[PDB]
Design a protein around this ligand. Structure first.
Ligand SMILES: [K+]
Ligand SMILES: [K+]
Ligand SMILES: [K+]
Ligand SMILES: [K+]
Ligand SMILES: [K+]
Ligand SMILES: [K+]
Ligand SMILES: [K+]
Ligand SMILES: [K+]
Ligand SMILES: [K+]
Ligand SMILES: [K+]
Ligand SMILES: [K+]
Ligand SMILES: [K+]
Ligand SMILES: [K+]
Ligand SMILES: [K+]
Ligand SMILES: [K+]
Ligand SMILES: [K+]
Ligand SMILES: [K+]
Ligand SMILES: [Mg+2]
Ligand SMILES: [Mg+2]
Ligand SMILES: [Mg+2]
Ligand SMILES: [Mg+2]
Ligand SMILES: [Mg+2]
Ligand SMILES: [Mg+2]
Ligand SMILES: [Mg+2]
Ligand SMILES: [Mg+2]
Ligand SMILES: [Mg+2]
Ligand SMILES: [Mg+2]
Ligand SMILES: [Mg+2]
Ligand SMILES: [Mg+2]
Ligand SMILES: [Mg+2]
Ligand SMILES: [Mg+2]
Ligand SMILES: [Mg+2]
Ligand SMILES: [Mg+2]
Ligand SMILES: [Mg+2]
Ligand SMILES: [Mg+2]
Ligand SMILES: [Mg+2]
Ligand SMILES: [Mg+2]
Ligand SMILES: [Mg+2]
Ligand SMILES: [Mg+2]
Ligand SMILES: [Mg+2]
Ligand SMILES: [Mg+2]
Ligand SMILES: [Mg+2]
Ligand SMILES: [Mg+2]
Ligand SMILES: [Mg+2]
Ligand SMILES: [Mg+2]
Ligand SMILES: [Mg+2]
Ligand SMILES: [Mg+2]
Ligand SMILES: [Mg+2]
Ligand SMILES: [Mg+2]
Ligand SMILES: [Mg+2]
Ligand SMILES: [Mg+2]
Ligand SMILES: [Mg+2]
Ligand SMILES: [Mg+2]
Ligand SMILES: [Mg+2]
Ligand SMILES: [Mg+2]
Ligand SMILES: [Mg+2]
Ligand SMILES: [Mg+2]
Ligand SMILES: [Mg+2]
Ligand SMILES: [Mg+2]
Ligand SMILES: [Mg+2]
Ligand SMILES: [Mg+2]
Ligand SMILES: [Mg+2]
Ligand SMILES: [Mg+2]
Ligand SMILES: [Mg+2]
Ligand SMILES: [Mg+2]
Ligand SMILES: [Mg+2]
Ligand SMILES: [Mg+2]
Ligand SMILES: [Mg+2]
Ligand SMILES: [Mg+2]
Ligand SMILES: [Mg+2]
Lengths: 95, 46, 283, 76
RNA sequence: AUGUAUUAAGGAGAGUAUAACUUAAUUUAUGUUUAUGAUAGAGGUUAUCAACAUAUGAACUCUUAGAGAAAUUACUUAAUAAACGAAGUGAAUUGAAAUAUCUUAUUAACUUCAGGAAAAGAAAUCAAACGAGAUUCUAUGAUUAGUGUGAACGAAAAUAGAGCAGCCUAUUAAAAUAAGUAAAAUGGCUUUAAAGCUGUUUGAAUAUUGUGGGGAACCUUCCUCAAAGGCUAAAUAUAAUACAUGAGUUACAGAGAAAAGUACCGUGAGGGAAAGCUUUGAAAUAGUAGUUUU
RNA sequence: UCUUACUAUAGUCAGGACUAUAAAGGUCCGAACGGGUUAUCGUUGCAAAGAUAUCCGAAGAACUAUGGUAAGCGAGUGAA
RNA sequence: GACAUGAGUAACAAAAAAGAGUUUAAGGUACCUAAAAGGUAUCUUAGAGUCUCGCCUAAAGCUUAUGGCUACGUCAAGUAACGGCCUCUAAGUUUAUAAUCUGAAGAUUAUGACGAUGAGAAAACUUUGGUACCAACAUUUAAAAGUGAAAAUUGUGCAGGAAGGAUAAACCGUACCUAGAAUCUGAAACAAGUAAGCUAGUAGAGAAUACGAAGGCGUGAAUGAGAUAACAAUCAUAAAGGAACUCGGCAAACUAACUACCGUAACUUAGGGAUAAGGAGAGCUCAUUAGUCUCGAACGAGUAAAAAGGAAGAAGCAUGGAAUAUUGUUGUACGACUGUUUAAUUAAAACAAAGCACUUUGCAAAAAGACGAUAAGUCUAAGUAUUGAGUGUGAUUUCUGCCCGAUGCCGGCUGGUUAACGAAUUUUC
RNA sequence: CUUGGCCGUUAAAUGCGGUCUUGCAUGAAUGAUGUAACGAUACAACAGCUGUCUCUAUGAUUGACUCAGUGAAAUUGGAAUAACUGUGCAGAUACAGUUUACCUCUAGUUAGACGAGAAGACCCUAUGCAGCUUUACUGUUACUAAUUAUUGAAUACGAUU
């Protein structure tokens, strides 16, 4: 080989026991017989909420112009923990 | 004269003899990497 | 257990040839021969087998007490069914009681000095042939283990007991080895009565080169056949010895009587050293 | 998994590399599903297929004219 | 190229608004000044028509848990290149017109250990009858004293400059003032024979009320210092970044690289390109035309 | 990853003949395979070692595959 | 670096091979027609296909590997109809641990981990040591017969022939190319080289030789069409003579294979020589037939049954008909022999070799030998004087004589010499 | 020396085989010597066979040649680049003299251009190298010997005297 040999080796180039995964994750364990037992505590699910009646869409009308928020006098305007706590007492005090 | 010494050459021997792990795991292989890294090589091994 | 690896080719742990003219032989297995024979009691010879890594034959014995099997260097004439016994771990109560005394040299030899029986050299009478002679009090057999070899008991450090019965006084006994050397050995050293089997081994002929290759022996290139760079004997136009005294590839005299035993290592067990032929033709 | 051709970083210049592979999955549905048929070339005016087709021929003829120069030839 | 300032772990893979950089790949806020700045509109993709300062969300895989054929597996709030420093080990080409001592050379290289620097350092130092006052770096002293058959190698005192800092109660936590040590013989190193370093075998003394070391073989007097215990910044070395300067380069120059350690060559270590822009168009060479000769 | 030797795990040798064997032979003739005796061609070659014919071994000291080990002060390997 | 010359020259020649039709897309010309268009024909570029002919064919075919600068819609719980990953371990590796050795680097031993070229349950539904073992060779065995495997059974020979573990379906590979026609290595589109299985049939002992069913091919203009001089290569035939050629029968020709055929010398280590030499036979038709097989009804008939068969017969120049197997004998030297060697100018008389001989090695902690900046330690060897190592010779028959002065080695004196050490001495300042 | 003497083989023998010896300079494990078998070893002879030859001829294919297409290389100081005799760093297309030749190509051929290529080959030189050898010079090791130290004793005998 001259040049293709200097490329990064891939699983589609050789077959003599060369295995390289795609980072799909471990979904179980290997057995001693050559099989695989899927561990469903490692398998992942996708929590999709019911979208029946949901009116919001991924776009906002361009008639409403984009204006950023303002927090005069506070350097940590949006990240102020006091503003989050003080506002919590006003709206929801129980939880 | 030159000979066809790469006839029947397998890529398993390339990784074993010239691979990255053959060097980071040896005293003399760390020099090759450090040497090739000082020169700016992209292909440090194989 | 199998005998494999690069050691079969004459290599050491470095991978370089340390023993020349080796490799490519037939696949073999090592036999675990019992050279100590500590377990007492009768042992029934099951069969005499052939051992490739040994010139003499081995005997598969069976301990009648427990049934465990073991290998031992078979004697000349030992056949299946023979009952061998090792009195190295002490004499059994019956034998002592039959005499009724601590020991009797004549009585003991008549009931234990049988072919294949392993005894301390002190118990074996003078003039008897043994073939598994040890050196240390609790060591394995090291001498005369090869085919057809044996040793004779020359003398024993003993004294008369006023009744014509000799009793051991010293700690060693002299024995003539296969090489004709009369050296000193421990009183409690083991020995087997008889001669090593396969006495006609050295009379064999291989007939062809291929048989030596099967025995893990590779060709031996002479020094005269090499160049002046590979051997002190190489060089010269045509057949020429170069007026150079015979030596090894590393300068060791190969003839003339040069002894390779380390000088500082003096043999303190030798009573009569070997006879040197001095290069004179034997026949 | 469908691999990708090895290419140079910047086309005709740069180091050699290989993009990330592509993965396709074929699911065995419990209920059949049939796709619609592609519109006829005469019914693609909503996508401006007329203008797109002209630009395509110009590109196919430009790569074809470059492929002739790659063979060391020229159009008489 | 040099100088000045600042800083003290480096790379790769794949992916992505192809000026915008990490699956959030153009995050979200504050203050000030806004043409007398800084150095009374239109425009949220027909975008970023605002700079400075201060905060802030995100920031994948490998080098880099273990394994393994680095960018995989399997797990997990696993993580530090080179150059420079010190000690140890230590050549040869070369010169002597050969060549052994010598020189090359306390060199190159390798190994260990360590930090942003390190090492060294406040005299058991030098001087010479007067005195100087730690260490480090540069110059002179000096093709000197001197050694060596030769070839060559080669100090120190002192002076000038850069820095300047002293101490043990060390500005980070250490000594009850140092014995198998000083020193001798012998085998070596260094070297001028001294001093210093060292394997082996031996082996001291107790302070100027003159005890110990040194002052270039050695003895003596005198002078000077006080080993066998320690701490210490700066001037210095290297690398990266920024800026300044130029009878420095302007594309076969500068650098190896104006898209480079890439392409390409080699199994490998390793070797290693060509290539600027819209300007100008020299010679050689080729096919013709005019005059002329054949 | 060539090549020499060794090593581990494996594989291959149509058919026929002689010999004491059904199987005991570095046996015989001869393909595959492995060699490279002789001649011609070729020599800026198809080929920095090739082509054609001829010839040798072809159950063995055989041949082949995938890995492994041993090389550069001292010399690794070497039927030399 | 550019551009000249050789030169528009050589080359595009693996002794497979081409011929005539047809057709698609885009584009270029000519005419028809001047309403643009379209149509007819032709050419260029990129393809496809039909008929005929030929070449390869135990391949130049098909299915897959090693590999890949060919291209990315290549789809699996497992078996039938699959590998990897995963479990186990070999040869080995180890900046893992402990101990030990060591100028540093490091090395050694043990354990662990890793490491295939091997071993891994079930399925057309599934989840002790010959009481042995699964190296080679031979034999036997899935009951109609034969053949080829698998596994097992039995036995033979010596060269005496692994290890370890056990016993509701993730992830990765899947495309194409296999070297005579576009893909691997040989700097390349190279007459070279590369692994596995399959690889029609006739005919044979056969994978030999010849034909060749399917398949593929008869190269990317990297060529095509003519002409058939010298000369060259590769072949064919040949009057008379038959080595007169030549350093030399170099090359070529003769011969050749087959049979349960006949016959076969000197010499011999009694095995051979020997397939010696030298002869005979062969295809087609047919008389004839004990059994086997078939048919009809013991017997009869039959080769549209295999075979046997004879001094039978026919035709032709010729019946080993085409292709395939390259002479015989004799005297010597050298080396016993089969083997090995300068990859790519010397294959041999050289090396090796069985045999023979000599020196060395007693194993009590290191047998000797070899390796170890140098040791621990390793190979030797889980060997023991009939063992291992070194040296020369080189099967066997018949033999191997003389000299120990020189050289080397070995042994030996309470000897001579004798550095260190040291009785006794001696000198500078 | 030498084609040693003789014998056999050839019409003709520096060869080959047998034999004899005075063997410049055979010789016994740097083994001596004689057979069987074996050999792509080397030498010689016989029979057969043939284009090896007397002595070549014809035939076949692929090249060679022409047209169309594509398109190299070594090499080249520059060239209007004949013959002879002479000359001359000593072998002339190029100088001297005389002679001869209209201009330009194609296919053949290789006598010359001391043709091209390869520092290929030989000899010599360098106080240039490498490898090898040894009773070369100067050194280092394996190895041997003595001894301080680790490490303390007892007895006997012999030797110097
Ligand atoms: K000199
Ligand atoms: K001087
Ligand atoms: K002090
Ligand atoms: K110009
Ligand atoms: K044969
Ligand atoms: K031509
Ligand atoms: K065939
Ligand atoms: K699977
Ligand atoms: K070390
Ligand atoms: K081929
Ligand atoms: K011939
Ligand atoms: K060979
Ligand atoms: K010999
Ligand atoms: K003598
Ligand atoms: K002598
Ligand atoms: K003597
Ligand atoms: K010529
Ligand atoms: Mg592939
Ligand atoms: Mg592949
Ligand atoms: Mg694996
Ligand atoms: Mg080479
Ligand atoms: Mg190979
Ligand atoms: Mg040997
Ligand atoms: Mg031998
Ligand atoms: Mg030999
Ligand atoms: Mg030689
Ligand atoms: Mg020598
Ligand atoms: Mg000679
Ligand atoms: Mg990781
Ligand atoms: Mg890791
Ligand atoms: Mg100075
Ligand atoms: Mg003090
Ligand atoms: Mg001292
Ligand atoms: Mg002094
Ligand atoms: Mg001194
Ligand atoms: Mg001092
Ligand atoms: Mg003085
Ligand atoms: Mg440049
Ligand atoms: Mg310019
Ligand atoms: Mg044979
Ligand atoms: Mg030629
Ligand atoms: Mg033969
Ligand atoms: Mg020409
Ligand atoms: Mg021509
Ligand atoms: Mg047209
Ligand atoms: Mg494992
Ligand atoms: Mg495997
Ligand atoms: Mg190719
Ligand atoms: Mg080819
Ligand atoms: Mg094909
Ligand atoms: Mg064709
Ligand atoms: Mg004729
Ligand atoms: Mg005739
Ligand atoms: Mg003649
Ligand atoms: Mg003649
Ligand atoms: Mg007739
Ligand atoms: Mg031979
Ligand atoms: Mg042979
Ligand atoms: Mg050769
Ligand atoms: Mg040859
Ligand atoms: Mg003999
Ligand atoms: Mg030893
Ligand atoms: Mg001989
Ligand atoms: Mg003295
Ligand atoms: Mg002799
Ligand atoms: Mg042409
Ligand atoms: Mg002349
Ligand atoms: Mg002129
Ligand atoms: Mg010619
Ligand atoms: Mg000229």
């Amino acid at each position: 080989g001259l040049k293709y040999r200097k490329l990064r080796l891939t699983t589609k180039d050789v077959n003599k026991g060369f295995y390289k995964g795609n980072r799909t994750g471990s979904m179980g364990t290997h057995t001693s017989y050559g099989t695989y037992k899927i561990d469903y505590t490692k398998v992942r699910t996708y929590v999709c909420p019911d979208l029946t009646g949901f009116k919001l869409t991924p776009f906002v009308s361009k008639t409403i112009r984009p204006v950023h928020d303002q927090f005069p006098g506070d350097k940590l305007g949006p990240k102020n923990p006091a503003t989050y706590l003080a506002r919590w007492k006003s709206e929801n005090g129980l939880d | 004269g030159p000979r066809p010494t790469m006839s029947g050459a397998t890529r398993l021997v390339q990784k074993r003899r010239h691979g990255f792990l053959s060097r980071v795991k040896t005293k003399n292989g760390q020099k090759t990497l450090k040497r090739r890294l000082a020169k700016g090589r992209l292909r440090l091994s194989a | 257990f199998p005998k494999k690896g690069q050691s079969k080719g004459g290599r050491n742990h470095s991978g370089r040839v340390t023993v020349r003219h080796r490799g490519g032989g037939h696949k073999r297995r090592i036999r675990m021969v019992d050279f100590e024979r500590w377990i007492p009691g009768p042992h029934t010879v099951l069969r005499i087998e052939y051992d490739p890594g040994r010139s003499a034959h081995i005997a598969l014995v069976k301990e009648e007490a427990t049934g465990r099997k073991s290998y031992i260097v078979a004697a000349d004439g030992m056949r299946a069914g023979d009952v061998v016994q090792s009195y190295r771990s002490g004499l059994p109560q019956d034998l002592l009681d039959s005499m009724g005394g601590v020991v009797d040299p004549g009585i003991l030899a008549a009931r234990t000095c049988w072919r294949g029986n392993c005894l301390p050299v002190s118990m074996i009478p003078v003039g008897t042939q043994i073939y598994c002679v040890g050196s240390r009090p609790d060591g394995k057999a090291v001498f005369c283990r090869s085919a057809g070899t044996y040793a004779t008991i020359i003398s024993k450090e003993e004294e008369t007991r006023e009744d014509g019965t000799k009793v051991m006084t010293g700690k060693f006994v002299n024995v003539r080895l296969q090489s004709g050397e009369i050296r000193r050995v421990s009183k409690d050293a083991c020995a087997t009565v008889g001669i090593a089997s396969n006495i006609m081994h050295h009379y064999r002929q291989l007939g062809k080169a291929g048989r030596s290759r099967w025995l893990n022996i590779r060709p031996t290139v002479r020094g005269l056949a090499m160049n002046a760079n590979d051997h002190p004997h190489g060089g010269g136009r045509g057949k020429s010895k170069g007026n150079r005294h015979p030596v090894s590839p590393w300068g060791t005299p190969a003839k003339g009587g040069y002894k390779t035993r380390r000088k500082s290592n003096v043999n303190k067990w030798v009573v009569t050293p070997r006879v040197r032929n001095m290069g004179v033709r034997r026949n | 998994v469908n691999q990708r051709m090895h290419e140079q970083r910047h086309g005709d210049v740069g180091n050699w590399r290989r993009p990330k592979s592509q993965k396709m999955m074929i699911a065995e549905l419990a209920k059949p599903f049939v796709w619609p048929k592609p519109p006829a070339e005469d019914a693609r005016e909503a996508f401006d297929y007329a203008m797109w087709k002209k630009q395509k021929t110009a590109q196919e003829q430009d790569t074809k004219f470059q492929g002739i120069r790659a063979q060391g030839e020229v159009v008489p």
